Design an enzyme around this catalytic site. Structure first.
Site, PDB file in Angstrom:
ATOM      1  N   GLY G   8       0.808  -1.204   0.000  1.00 37.24           N
ATOM      2  CA  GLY G   8       0.000   0.000   0.000  1.00 37.24           C
ATOM      3  C   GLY G   8       0.843   1.257   0.000  1.00 37.24           C
ATOM      4  N   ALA G  10       1.279   3.587  -2.174  1.00 40.78           N
ATOM      5  CA  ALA G  10       0.863   4.647  -3.083  1.00 40.78           C
ATOM      6  C   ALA G  10      -0.280   5.484  -2.520  1.00 40.78           C
ATOM      7  CB  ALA G  10       0.462   4.069  -4.443  1.00 40.78           C
ATOM      8  N   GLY G  11      -0.647   5.282  -1.263  1.00 43.40           N
ATOM      9  CA  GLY G  11      -1.683   6.048  -0.604  1.00 43.40           C
ATOM     10  C   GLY G  11      -1.134   7.286   0.072  1.00 43.40           C
ATOM     11  N   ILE G  13      -0.044   7.632   3.591  1.00 45.62           N
ATOM     12  CA  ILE G  13       1.146   7.291   4.363  1.00 45.62           C
ATOM     13  C   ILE G  13       2.219   6.619   3.517  1.00 45.62           C
ATOM     14  CG2 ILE G  13      -0.233   5.313   5.110  1.00 45.62           C
ATOM     15  CD1 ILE G  13       1.584   5.024   7.529  1.00 45.62           C
ATOM     16  N   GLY G  14       1.823   5.852   2.503  1.00 45.10           N
ATOM     17  CA  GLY G  14       2.732   5.013   1.743  1.00 45.10           C
ATOM     18  C   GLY G  14       3.882   5.699   1.032  1.00 45.10           C
ATOM     19  N   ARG G  81      -9.752   8.903   6.427  1.00 42.26           N
ATOM     20  CA  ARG G  81     -11.104   9.309   6.785  1.00 42.26           C
ATOM     21  C   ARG G  81     -11.732  10.140   5.672  1.00 42.26           C
ATOM     22  NH1 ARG G  81      -9.272   5.688  10.374  1.00 42.26           N
ATOM     23  NH2 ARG G  81     -10.691   5.543  12.164  1.00 42.26           N
ATOM     24  N   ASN G  94     -10.974  -1.468   5.764  1.00 40.41           N
ATOM     25  CA  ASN G  94      -9.592  -1.646   6.202  1.00 40.41           C
ATOM     26  C   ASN G  94      -9.332  -3.086   6.619  1.00 40.41           C
ATOM     27  OD1 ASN G  94     -10.134   1.050   5.951  1.00 40.41           O
ATOM     28  ND2 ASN G  94      -9.171   1.663   7.882  1.00 40.41           N
ATOM     29  N   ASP G 150       2.263   6.994  19.588  1.00 40.21           N
ATOM     30  CA  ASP G 150       1.971   7.411  20.954  1.00 40.21           C
ATOM     31  C   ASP G 150       3.245   7.722  21.728  1.00 40.21           C
ATOM     32  OD1 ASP G 150      -0.822   6.591  20.400  1.00 40.21           O
ATOM     33  OD2 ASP G 150      -0.005   4.563  20.603  1.00 40.21           O
ATOM     34  N   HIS G 177      -4.007   1.651  20.759  1.00 44.03           N
ATOM     35  CA  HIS G 177      -3.745   2.759  19.844  1.00 44.03           C
ATOM     36  C   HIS G 177      -5.047   3.402  19.381  1.00 44.03           C
ATOM     37  CE1 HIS G 177      -1.166   5.300  17.624  1.00 44.03           C
ATOM     38  NE2 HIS G 177      -1.328   4.750  16.435  1.00 44.03           N
TER      39      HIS G 177
END
Lengths: 198, 317, 232, 109, 201, 126, 317
Positions: G8, G10-11, G13-14, G81, G94, G150, G177
């Site tokens: 993943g 390419a999203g 975060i990726g 989101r 997810n 965190d 988390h």
């Protein structure tokens, strides 16, 4: 306030035979505290314009701190979070040094032409200063490239300075009144220390 | 312990560039700025456990407060490629944005390093130079054009082809930062390796068209957004080291140089405390006939680009 | 050269006393000034950073005026100055009160005059083992200090050129000038006065008050090392 | 200073060039070594003859040794001395400068 | 130059100069010219007579050029090496040694190339002065300048000018890497992550 | 918080002992007959420049091997060591018979022949 | 000389996560993979002059070839989101993505370090554990929950409040988390500093609601994409250091441990060559009454989350 007119390093080591490893930290803390008070009580923001470079006791303090750090690091072979890097030639160098110590304690082109071809065209001692020069240069380059034990003492003195600053900042009134006293009366003793600690 | 201000840190290039600038061990204050969506970037960057503080400013009204005590000004602002949109309207939008930003930095902080990232930087650096000239605050030694990406691409391609270990491989790049004007100096590549003819030909055309290969590989999704941020972060780190007093800060930038008749030219420079300190003059002597006629071919194109930039930068209001 | 030395000597509020200055002393193709340090500096027994900056600014003065007047074709007439400055500049960095290189193991003792004592040139001083990066910081600091005094000297010597060529014309006409003549000639000229460098930081003897700090020591630990390379 | 590595330059500063200083001596010994092998391998018959004479007589003077050399010697093409090199360089320089003279004259006249 | 003889064998040439006192100043160009004039016999013997015909004396001529170039770089201070005065013995920290070596090598490249370019243009004058010296054994300044101004000159390709930054560009603390900075993000030391491009974290 | 400088005079002795099997007697980590030092020698051989790191690693290896042998055969008599310390503190005199009694009652474990620092190259006499 | 596969990349975060993974001195080869837009990311990362190779695979057809010789599996896939959409549907999408990804891993490489990032990870790590159990290849020592965000936020807030040096500060964090389940152990913070009651309360609520603060500060533009990449890169480099044999790989992960009655719990663990080597037992006792009541409050919510995850992972097809 009058100027004084030297070999305290040897006395502390010759008096300490089987002492602890924690008193070395206290000695280093006591030998590096005057610069903390000087840097704290001298007014900020000159371009270093009011420092007292190359005078009497700061050189002895620096030498004492360097010697204490060297003694602490050479004898490391909890108190300390980490240890010195211990350059991987110190061990065999120490072994060879101990062996040699125990052994010690256990006791211009040849201006005359050669008529025979067997003789050489050059004297053996012609190019001898250049050999020593090249050997000395190479040895200097080799020795001045392997001090992996220079970044450890600096940060230790940094934390010592930080602790000294944090301790001096809270008790700044003590040194402030004490400096006022020293400016007031020229001479000063330890009974006045213990009286003015209030 | 220096302050960096990124103008346009909420676009494509801006967010990875800002993230990479944050992880630098010399940055202590970071001033993000964009017309919109800069609060979220500051919220994202305010949680990393790095002592470089992050503050953001939104809108041109607070842009005046963005440039206080700023040492390095980074300008990656400029909209990416859009469908149906030609070269002239893109140049107009990017040039207007950079013109307003250079007016702002001239009004607020005229003694700060200026890095231009918006494309084409060949016709954008003269715009910044003319706008700084219009305010009497122009310093030719403190205005750079980021063309490091060509050097990185050249090093990557040369190390891939010649099977050299990529750490030591550096290829000099001259000209500009737009297509044919980028000329890699493959005859001066260290470590010393012998090249053939068709290898040099294919390496040169690959280095010149790696940008268009990137933009057609994305299928119209924009331009390079990770390699451009890489090159901009490398140049920002080098400029920050130059302010630190290091005497061996050498880079490849598109600056105002008199090595040719062209006022602006991309070449190897040496940056000091007060900006530009030296220009490597030996890059243009020692070329073969290939690099000679390549320079002769790229000179007219770079001259046209710079003339277009100066022509836009002096248009009446 | 001599006029630049004299000007940068007399541009300062508290420099040494200028006895005299003679061009071509006894037929030699050179020139010489005589400066006598004030008695307070001798009685102090140490030197301050402001006083050593005093010395390299004044020592820069001659070559700086030569370069200002004749241009960028700089000769080797101030080579001794280019030596002396450097020596004093080294005392700027070797000293344990340096902010950047105070808490580092500089020149160490093997084991055993003048106002400015060169600790580097002591017979028992032999330079300690350094790394590549630590030596680069030493070179960077010495270059910084030399360039700072250099910039001060250039700025001062373009600040007032009229006094420079006035003392120059005196040096051609008389072939020898004295400090009293020098002081009386710029008395009605109003030069750009330099700030005082050696004004002592002092405590009020009995004013009961908590004098402040910033709140810290200014020493920065020596930790400069690049990240390890790739492919590990 | 008699080498041709950079141009003589018997002293350097960095350790790499100091190490390379002693490399050229060993390569020079190696090339002299192969040259000695080639020279002594060219002359096997005279070698055996002079060894036999040295064993039988225990001594040898110039005349008989040189006679044996002329009887069984190989070709020894002598390199030119400095005089022949100076002469050929001088004639080459004269012919080149007169070539320059004509390329100036007949192009100008 | 005033008089010239070849009647003596010496380590130095037997030339005579007309000494005029007054050397108050000497520019960088004068130092470069002295460096060029220092290494003349080795270049001339390598040109006419080849490498394998060098004398032990004439090959000990570029050593003085080496000493003069080190003097120019270290003890004069108009090069890009810095603006300090270093006495060759011990105030040479290990960072400046590669810079000194690179600047010295660049200066010898320039000086040797200039020596090889000057002599090949004045080859006719060179051989004419050589022949006159061979015949007479004692030559004067006036005939030297006459042969200099009357002998033909062969045009030569221009030499590449000397630059110091082009040789110091590959002599730094890090080395060859530092010009091609890869950049790396390291999280291993401590609880922090740094992305550095040659910079010390 | 309470360390000692008492064992230092022994530890450098260990730093003396290990190199002797590497340089002098040839009892190295690989039983090599390479000898670089003699009883009447003033210095060593050429020793190389990068070859010193190898023998230094060998010497640190044998030193650490002896250290780990001592640790393994000393941490298994922890309670016996505590017993000996408190008897020495409360009596101020101990004899060999008393030490034998302490290591017998409290369960002292002795080592057994053959004694080697490394068993990867040990052989048996004929 | 290790091999890392980002699932993943390419999203949101990726791309920064791949950018950070590429530039590490431990990665030498890297498979980027996503359902779309993974060609451009690989093209952009193929120009950086770092010797870590970049190859990419598109679609489930090449997912079989993506997981060969892989030592570390990185799974940041998961939709950010969106407006108008609830917790349930995000949980389903997810969870379905992570089911497909961990099933592909179990089919191809049972012996690779598995890092689960997709939210909510508290109910997602049990899903990965169940789908690894269903194939008989479940290794509980080689499956982690990335919960370093965190810890990073705790260090940032503590060093900002108490004015300590940022590198030295590290704050233990236990629980999970998602909101309330994050309990920072402020009484076990090194270096030793004394806290008050109000400071501990405000730090605890700030740590628990920092993610909410970011997602409202972005004005619905998504979630944290740069600090998430920072924490994921830190955990990936820690896992790669564990593969090197480094003997002090101590991290804070959400793994299947038996400290409490909960099957999965986030705490300090020590990672080895084979994965989980130890779990730090000094974190769960010595707490004050504040941490005790916070733990017994978050225990039921964590149990509900884990039950939701394990029930949704076991639904019939």
């Amino acid at each position: 306030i009058y100027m004084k007119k030297s070999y305290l390093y040897k006395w502390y080591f010759e008096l300490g035979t089987s002492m602890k490893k924690f008193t070395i930290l206290l000695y280093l803390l006591s030998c590096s505290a005057g610069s903390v008070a000087q840097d704290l009580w001298s007014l900020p923001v000159p371009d270093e314009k009011n420092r007292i470079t190359s005078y009497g006791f700061v050189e002895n303090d620096s030498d004492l701190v360097h010697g204490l750090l060297e003694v602490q690091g050479a004898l490391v072979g909890t108190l300390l979070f980490r240890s010195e890097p211990r350059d991987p030639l110190y061990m065999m160098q120490d072994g060879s040094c101990s062996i040699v110590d125990q052994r010690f304690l256990y006791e211009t082109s040849q201006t005359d032409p050669p008529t025979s071809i067997y003789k050489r065209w050059f004297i053996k001692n012609t190019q001898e200063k250049h050999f020593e020069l090249l050997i000395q240069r190479q040895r200097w380059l080799r020795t001045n490239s392997s001090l992996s034990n220079g970044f450890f003492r600096s940060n230790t003195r940094s934390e010592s300075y930080q602790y000294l600053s944090n301790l001096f900042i809270s008790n700044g009134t003590l040194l402030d009144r004490m400096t006022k006293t020293l400016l007031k009366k020229r001479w000063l003793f330890s009974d006045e220390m213990k009286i003015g600690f209030m | 312990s220096y302050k960096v201000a990124v103008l346009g840190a909420a676009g494509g290039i801006g967010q990875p560039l800002s993230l990479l600038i944050k992880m630098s061990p010399l940055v202590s204050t970071l001033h993000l700025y964009d017309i919109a969506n800069v609060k979220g970037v500051a919220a994202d960057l305010s949680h990393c456990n790095t002592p470089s503080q992050v503050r953001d400013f939104t809108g041109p009204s607070e842009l005046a407060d963005c440039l206080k005590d700023v040492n390095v000004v980074v300008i990656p602002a400029g909209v990416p490629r859009k469908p149906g949109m030609t070269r002239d309207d893109l140049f107009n939008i990017n040039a207007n944005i950079v013109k307003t930003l250079v007016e702002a930095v001239a009004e607020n902080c005229p003694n700060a390093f200026i890095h231009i990232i918006s494309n084409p930087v060949n016709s954008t650096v003269p715009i910044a130079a003319e706008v700084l000239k219009k305010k009497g605050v122009y310093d030719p030694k403190k205005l750079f054009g980021v063309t490091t990406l060509d050097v990185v691409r050249a090093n990557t391609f040369v190390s891939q082809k010649k099977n050299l270990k990529l750490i030591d491989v550096d290829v000099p790049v001259i000209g500009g930062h737009a297509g044919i004007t980028i000329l890699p100096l493959l005859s001066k590549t260290k470590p010393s390796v012998n090249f053939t003819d068709e290898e040099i030909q294919e390496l040169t055309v690959r280095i010149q068209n790696a940008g268009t290969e990137v933009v057609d590989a994305k299928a119209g999704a924009g331009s390079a957004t990770l390699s451009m941020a890489y090159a901009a972060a490398r140049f920002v780190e080098s400029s920050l080291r130059a302010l630190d007093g290091d005497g061996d800060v050498y880079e490849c930038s598109f600056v105002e140089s008199t090595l040719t008749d062209l006022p602006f030219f991309a070449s190897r420079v040496k940056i000091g405390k007060n900006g530009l300190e030296a220009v490597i003059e030996s890059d243009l002597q020692g070329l073969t006939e290939y690099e000679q006629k390549a320079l002769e071919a790229l000179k007219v194109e770079l001259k046209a680009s710079i003339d277009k930039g100066v022509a836009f930068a002096n248009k009446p209001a | 050269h001599e006029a630049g030395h004299i000007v940068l000597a007399h541009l300062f509020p508290r420099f040494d006393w200028h006895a005299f200055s003679q061009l071509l002393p006894g037929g030699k193709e050179t020139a010489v000034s005589v400066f006598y340090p004030r008695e307070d500096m001798v009685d102090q027994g140490y030197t301050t950073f402001g006083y050593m900056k005093m010395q390299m600014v004044v020592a820069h003065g001659g070559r700086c005026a030569e370069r200002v007047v004749f241009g960028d074709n700089v000769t080797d007439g101030g080579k001794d100055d280019l030596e002396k400055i450097t020596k004093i500049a080294r005392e700027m960095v070797i000293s344990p009160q340096s902010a950047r290189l105070g808490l580092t193991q500089l020149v160490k003792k093997i084991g055993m005059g003048e106002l400015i004592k060169y600790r580097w040139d002591h017979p028992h001083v032999m330079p300690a083992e350094m790394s590549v990066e630590v030596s680069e910081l030493f070179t960077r600091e010495l270059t910084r200090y030399i360039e700072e005094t250099e910039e001060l000297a250039m700025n001062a010597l373009r600040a007032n050129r009229h006094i420079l060529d006035l003392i120059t014309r005196e040096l051609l006409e008389k072939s020898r000038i004295t400090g009293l003549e020098v002081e009386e000639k710029m008395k009605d000229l109003s030069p750009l006065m330099f700030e005082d460098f050696v004004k002592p930081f002092q405590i009020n003897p009995d004013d009961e008050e908590l004098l402040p700090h910033k709140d810290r020591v200014s020493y920065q630990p020596v930790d400069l090392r690049a990240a390890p390379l790739h492919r590990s | 200073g008699l080498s041709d590595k950079h141009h003589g330059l018997n002293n350097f500063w960095v350790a790499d060039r100091i190490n390379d200083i002693d490399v050229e001596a060993l390569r020079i010994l190696n090339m002299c070594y192969e040259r000695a092998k080639e020279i002594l391998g060219r002359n096997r018959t005279l070698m055996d003859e002079v060894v036999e004479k040295l064993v039988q007589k225990k001594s040898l003077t110039k005349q008989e040794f040189f006679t044996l050399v002329e009887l069984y010697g190989s070709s020894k093409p002598m390199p030119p001395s400095i005089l022949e090199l100076r002469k050929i360089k001088r004639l080459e320089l004269e012919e080149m400068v007169l070539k320059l003279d004509m390329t100036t004259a007949r192009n100008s006249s | 130059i005033s008089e010239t003889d070849i009647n003596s064998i010496r380590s130095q040439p037997n030339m005579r100069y007309s000494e005029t006192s007054g050397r108050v100043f000497a520019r960088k160009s004068d130092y470069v010219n002295s460096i060029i004039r220092a290494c003349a016999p080795r270049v001339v013997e390598e040109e006419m007579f080849g490498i394998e015909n060098l004398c032990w004396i004439s090959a000990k001529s570029t050593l003085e050029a080496s000493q003069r170039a080190e003097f120019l770089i270290l003890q004069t201070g108009m090069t890009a090496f810095g603006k300090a005065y270093y006495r060759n013995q011990r105030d040479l920290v290990p960072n400046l040694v590669p810079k000194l070596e690179a600047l010295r090598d660049e200066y010898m490249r320039f000086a040797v190339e200039k020596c090889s370019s000057i002599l090949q243009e004045y080859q006719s004058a060179l051989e004419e002065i050589t022949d006159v010296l061979l015949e007479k054994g004692e030559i004067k300044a006036d005939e030297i300048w006459n042969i200099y101004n009357t002998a033909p000159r062969i045009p030569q390709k221009p030499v590449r000018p000397v630059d110091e930054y082009g040789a110091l560009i590959y002599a730094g603390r890090w080395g060859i890497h530092g010009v091609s900075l890869p950049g790396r993000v390291t999280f291993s030391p401590g609880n922090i992550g740094f992305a550095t491009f040659g910079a010390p974290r | 918080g309470d360390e000692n400088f008492l064992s230092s005079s022994e530890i450098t002795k260990a730093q003396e002992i290990a190199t002797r099997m590497v340089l002098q007697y040839g009892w190295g980590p690989d039983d090599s007959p390479a000898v670089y030092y003699a009883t009447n020698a003033v210095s060593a051989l050429s020793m190389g420049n990068n070859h010193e790191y190898e023998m230094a690693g060998k010497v640190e290896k044998i030193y650490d091997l002896a250290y780990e042998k001592a640790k393994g055969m000393l941490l298994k008599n922890r309670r016996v060591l505590e017993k000996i310390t408190e008897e020495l503190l409360e009596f101020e005199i101990l004899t060999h018979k008393d030490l034998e009694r302490i290591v017998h009652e409290n369960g002292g474990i002795r080592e057994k022949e053959p004694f080697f620092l490394s068993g990867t190259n040990y052989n048996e006499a004929l």
